[PDB]
Amino acid sequence: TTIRIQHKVGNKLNKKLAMGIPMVRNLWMHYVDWEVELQFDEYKNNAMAWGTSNRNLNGEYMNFGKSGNAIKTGAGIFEQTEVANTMYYNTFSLKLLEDALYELSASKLAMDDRLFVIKTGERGAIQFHKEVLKTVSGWTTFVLDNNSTRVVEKVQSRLHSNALSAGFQFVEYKAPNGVRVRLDVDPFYDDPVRNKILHPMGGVAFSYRYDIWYIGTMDQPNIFKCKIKGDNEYRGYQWGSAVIHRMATLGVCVLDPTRTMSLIPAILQG
Amino acid sequence: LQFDEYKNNAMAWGTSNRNLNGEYMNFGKSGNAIKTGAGIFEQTEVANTMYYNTFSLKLLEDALYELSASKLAMDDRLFVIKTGERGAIQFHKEVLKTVSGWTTFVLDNNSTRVVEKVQSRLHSNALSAGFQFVEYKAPNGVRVRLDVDPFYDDPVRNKILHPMGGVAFSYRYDIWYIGTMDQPNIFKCKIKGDNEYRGYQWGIRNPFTGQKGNPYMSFDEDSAVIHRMATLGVCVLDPTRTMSLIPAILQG
Amino acid sequence: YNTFSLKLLEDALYELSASKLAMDDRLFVIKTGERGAIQFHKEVLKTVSGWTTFVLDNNSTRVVEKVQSRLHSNALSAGFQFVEYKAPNGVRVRLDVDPFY
Amino acid sequence: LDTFLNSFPTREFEDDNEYYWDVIGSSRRNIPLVEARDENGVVVAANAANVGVGTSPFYLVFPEDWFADGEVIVGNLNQVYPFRILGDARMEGTNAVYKVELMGGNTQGVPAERLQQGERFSIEFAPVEKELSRKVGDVRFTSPVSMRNEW
Amino acid sequence: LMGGNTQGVPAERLQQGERFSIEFAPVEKELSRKVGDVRFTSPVSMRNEW
Amino acid sequence: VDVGCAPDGAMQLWVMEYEVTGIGKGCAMCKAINPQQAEMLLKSNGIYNGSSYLYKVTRIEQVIVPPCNGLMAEQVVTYKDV
Amino acid sequence: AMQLWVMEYEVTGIGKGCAMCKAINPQQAEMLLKSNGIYNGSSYLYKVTRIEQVIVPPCNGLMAEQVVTYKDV
Amino acid sequence: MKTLRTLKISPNAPDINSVWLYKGTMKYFNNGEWETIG
Amino acid sequence: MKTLRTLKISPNAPDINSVWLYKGTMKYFNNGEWETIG
Amino acid sequence: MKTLRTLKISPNAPDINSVWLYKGTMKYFNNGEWETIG
Amino acid sequence: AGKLGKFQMLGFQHWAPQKATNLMVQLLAFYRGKS
Amino acid sequence: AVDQMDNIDERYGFVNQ
Amino acid sequence: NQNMIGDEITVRDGTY
Ligand SMILES: [Mg+2]
Ligand SMILES: [Mg+2]
């Protein structure tokens, strides 16, 4: 796919300006070469991860540009990995999660090779914490004590000789037959600009999206960024009017999309 | 001593006497306006206003997590609470209510050590008792810790008492530093080269400087008057880097 | 006082110590008699018995000890006493019984 | 009280007038929708049919000229309905209306529910051809406001 | 009443037993005249016999 | 903005959370000159002003009027909080 | 950008709520709640029951109050 | 099935893994509701 | 003298050292049979 | 607010911090006396 | 379970003394863009 | 300079003059 | 007119 930017410009702002006013109680000079490089690096970031294809099954592209030639676009990260293993839930459960991850691992993975690193947002981590805690609270066979778990430990404080601390968080869940589910947080799920539907428990409803990249070992990368050898990024200045033009071609390839599982909230669908 | 107390009470406890119309209404003895600026404790309450009667730990953690959600790093979420001694007991009981709702877990004495063994002549197995919850660790990196300051429990300036014992200012929680800013957030303002004024107005002899005899007299009376003067202010750059939690019987 | 309670003495010794003493200075050695120690023991038993938010196992307290006897292989003893109490913000209480009392 | 005020540093000033400091926010913003019209200019109500049924043009009215000549913007559902802007903004007073077609291979149109007032829209990127390309897109900036104190 | 106060102080804040303490003495910048003052204290003694 | 209200001349808007003991929890929106006066308007003009000792107010926070349109403040009391 | 509107509503099945908007008419104050509120993806759940304008000269008064009780759940 | 190890005396509702005791009525949390025993 | 520690919610009877709670009837093991409290 | 972690079947009043189960009654310590449920 | 507005982002078209600090201040009552 | 929580810095885009 | 310099603050209580 091919990306292009322009700006009619020197160091000073132009017509697309926006001010930020805070709510408190009693209510420079723009470097234009750092904004055309940052907001064109982000055009390539949005084309790589959040891009969509416009072809038929007849091979025909559907959108034509200013020159009458068709705008050729290729799918991104998040569309190519959403052609297999993708689930849209209305309520999060470990009953849905441990059954989705076991049947894929029983049919594709050896028992030692069953580590599943959930990449999610920050509020997806507190929702996974409360769903393991609800599951652990139904394990009435075992009496959970502070001796092993240490949810209440002893901290050193000036105020008391025996001074305590409190708090914990479930970050891992281990399922039968070797299915281990870990959890780490990517910060880009919590984007207030791109993610605009809100979740009633806090956040932007995209942090509640769970993405298992890297199912298994492949002996090669499954997902990578395509590039042309040499220098495929272009730059031009059109002095009259003084317009800075930038152009860049790029691509993303997912070889096996069946090795990527996604749990998206169903409020982000349709 | 009294001039330094004037300097500390102005810097900490100052209120801006500028009106809503941008005018000053307090006029001095000459007739010009007395212009004052906000203190430490007025500049710091404009953003994270909070008042209460019943302390809730859930509301404290869900107000330190909604401004530090994806803005502060996971290792940058230690929030030290400066408060009084009676704010530490109100914090202790509220964490104690939180860990008594955790009925999934059993808080055994073998790890919390609330009842300890001590040596005594009274018994062969003599026991001790006592504990205090001084820290709560919220999920996703947020840690909350107390720092009891004797500045809060001062019974001279703080006259409104609390019904649960002590002054009401002891029950006030202020998290002055949230994260790292790349610069000092709270500092004290001074003018460069501005030495604080000191002058004497004396007649035939000066008791202050021990001087007998005056070439240039102020008046004919046998006296000496000392005048001291200082221009001073404070600054809080980011008041959203600071959270307050005040008892509402202080009436804002 | 007419009847002794820990709610009385802990508040009598915390309003005193918050007003007059520092944090590390709130050690109170109470001089009393033999009957005042049992009266002390029953109140800090009654206060700790209300702490049902903690399970007080025998592994830490050792109120029931394993002794050696001719009668049984797993023979036991039973007994304890509470001689101290640690109130919040640094207040400790230690008993010092005196035969003159 | 003096032990508390000694933990704060001291910045020295030149004059005794009021002093300022400039506070800033981000340059990346989403813009609400005002209304959406189809190709004949009549507004898309909530009880209406789909709008872009044949890669057909329609209009998106925004309260500010924030979007540019050839960018793909998305609604509240990102990447489900990509909207490629056709041409510059026609300014209906302060409002800016863009002629808009659907981009992501969409052959059934966007629902009428997805084109209502209040839905925020966000810039993704600006795609062009491989052959004979022309200029698209634009760059957005941000401005600081000031706070104040005195002596 | 300083602080920018326009609508006054309530009447129940000005009753017998209300305690007042000294904050500071702010002056104008131009042609200010002398304000504020300075305070002193003194101790006591106790006694015993045989 | 100088309408003649008590706190230095301006109108002040507040949000209150509380928990009625034995009954439940609730939200409130209230204009009041002090945050002390906002909690006295719950005990005087509330739904449970008769048994006004039940109100355990846990937050009183000020709402600042924005320069233009938008949702200022919101407070949902869900059934699973209660 | 003209007036202030305090709304009492009821998220259907989830609970009761309180809100405050700034809008020219109460038809836009409901628009700024359903589109910018927390129930943004399920905005059909908002059932607004009372809207009243914030007029000043009382300067001290309740505007909304709504308790979720133990027998409503 | 579901074992409860605590009984809580409170006018407010406790956590759902506890027994609600208030003045003479006993309750417990079953099927998403506080269910009166009596 | 018999210390019951756990309460169990089950549609059929649990062990004799536990309290039986079902739908609003508290039953416990006294005098060899399940005795309903009410 | 007050956790009663044990229940004791006895014809005598066990303790403040336990529940007193006698034949068809469930008494507990409230307001300085034993309050029977049901 | 409710928000409060701490900022509002407006376009400019809908609108020296001493400086305390020279470098600008990013408030925590402002979202910031994510890479 | 992008922050550890992926947040970009807006103060790099300015020139003091 | 014993003006403490600073920037400009003018003291006025008699000759000094
Ligand atoms: Mg896939
Ligand atoms: Mg602040």
Author numbering:
A (entry chain D): 203 to 211, 213 to 230, 243 to 455, 475 to 504
B (entry chain C): 253 to 504
C (entry chain B): 304 to 404
D (entry chain C): 52 to 202
E (entry chain B): 153 to 202
F (entry chain g): 21 to 102
G (entry chain h): 30 to 102
H (entry chain i), I (entry chain j), J (entry chain k): 1 to 38
Q: What do the authors report?
A:
The portal protein is considered the nucleation point for capsid assembly and serves as the docking site for the tail. The portal is surrounded by the five-fold symmetric capsid vertex, contacting 10 major capsid protein subunits. The surrounding capsid vertex was also reconstructed with C5-symmetrical averaging to a resolution of 3.30 Å. The portal oligomer positioned in the vertex occludes the binding site of the capsid auxiliary protein gp36, which is substituted by two copies of the portal vertex specific auxiliary protein, gp57. The gp57 dimer has approximate two-fold symmetry, reinforced by disulfide bonds between residues 47–47 and 25–88 of the two subunits. Notably, hexameric capsomers bordering the unique vertex contain trimer capsid fibres of gp21, in contrast to the hexamers bordering other pentameric vertices, which contain dimeric capsid fibres of gp29.
Virus ΦcrAss001 (Kehishuvirus primarius) was the first representative of this order to be isolated in pure culture from human faecal samples. Here, we present the characterization of ΦcrAss001 using cryo-electron microscopy (cryo-EM), enabling de novo structure building and elucidation of functions for around 1,440 protein subunits constituting the virion, leading to the identification of a novel ‘crass fold’ in the distal part of the tail. The virion possesses a short non-contractile tail extending approximately 44 nm from an icosahedral capsid. The extended tail barrel formed by widely conserved paralogous ring proteins has a high capacity for storage of cargo proteins alongside the capsid cargo zone, ensuring that the proteins required for the initial stages of crassvirus infection are carried inside virions and delivered to the host cell.
